[PDB]
Amino acid sequence: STSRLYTLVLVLQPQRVLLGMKKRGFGAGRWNGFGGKVQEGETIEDGAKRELLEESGLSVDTLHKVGHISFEFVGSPELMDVHIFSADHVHGTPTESEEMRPQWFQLDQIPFADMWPDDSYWFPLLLQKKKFCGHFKFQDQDTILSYSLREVDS
Ligand SMILES: Nc1nc(NC2CC2)cc(-c2cccc(Cl)c2Cl)n1
């Protein structure tokens, strides 16, 4: 049983981060970066850009490679293969979409309590400008059974 490709784009700036409140579907009622499924016929980076445009209304020329996290759940055959990107520069205005309502948070005021539990572990690596690689086994949606997390030169 193989995995499916996901992207996650974190809109960063010197003092703040633009998260998105998920309004519907998987992760509804939680703050997260912008992203979703990688389709057939686009590269992973194209998918990241697309989902950022569609969910926030923002454009980019380029993204940074910051993380590669593989998620799995107990009693589930399908794995999430997440390619995490930072967008430290953006064009346009943040606009509320059907799927996401964007909001700015200062980097010392990130609402980890209402984000996915894994974010508390890998966000510090992102904010130190470290590239990271890891696996997370979830018991349920609020409970990490086991996890592995390391930095990489890549
Ligand atoms: N921060 C974070 N954490 C996650 N933790 C995994 C237990 C669910 C999953 C995701 C994610 C990334 C891209 C697309 C989608 Cl649908 C999701 Cl849910 N993001």
Side-chain angles (χ1 to χ4, degrees):
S1 297
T2 196
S3 71
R4 212 208 177 99
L5 287 165
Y6 293 81
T7 57
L8 185 59
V9 188
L10 294 128
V11 176
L12 260 70
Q13 286 208 320
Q15 302 280 56
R16 55 180 188 167
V17 64
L18 179 81
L19 301 180
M21 171 51 59
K22 191 108 177 203
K23 297 157 71 168
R24 57 199 272 182
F26 191 64
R30 271 158 152 156
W31 296 99
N32 201 1
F34 307 100
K37 281 177 173 187
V38 181
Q39 300 176 319
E40 303 149 47
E42 70 184 351
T43 62
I44 294 167
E45 195 165 322
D46 288 321
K49 290 174 173 179
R50 178 177 58 77
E51 297 278 22
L52 186 64
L53 195 74
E54 290 170 0
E55 297 174 347
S56 76
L58 304 170
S59 288
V60 300
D61 299 320
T62 309
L63 303 176
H64 295 279
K65 314 297 169 287
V66 300
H68 190 168
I69 310 299
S70 47
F71 297 98
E72 70 180 60
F73 280 79
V74 173
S76 177
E78 202 174 321
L79 178 139
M80 294 183 78
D81 196 49
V82 186
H83 292 250
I84 306 175
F85 299 81
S86 87
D88 63 3
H89 185 79
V90 280
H91 308 132
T93 311
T95 303
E96 181 169 5
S97 75
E98 187 80 294
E99 194 183 347
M100 299 288 258
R101 181 175 74 246
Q103 187 175 308
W104 291 105
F105 295 84
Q106 189 156 321
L107 296 171
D108 74 329
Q109 292 174 1
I110 300 163
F112 290 109
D114 194 39
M115 293 157 79
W116 285 106
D118 59 275
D119 296 24
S120 296
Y121 298 91
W122 62 260
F123 246 87
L125 301 178
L126 180 63
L127 304 183
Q128 296 164 29
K129 316 303 167 64
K130 286 159 156 48
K131 300 168 181 194
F132 55 87
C133 184
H135 178 264
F136 281 79
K137 189 165 191 171
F138 277 75
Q139 177 62 73
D140 61 38
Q141 295 75 230
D142 308 275
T143 313
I144 299 169
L145 180 60
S146 56
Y147 79 94
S148 199
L149 189 64
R150 74 198 178 88
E151 288 81 82
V152 294
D153 299 283
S154 199

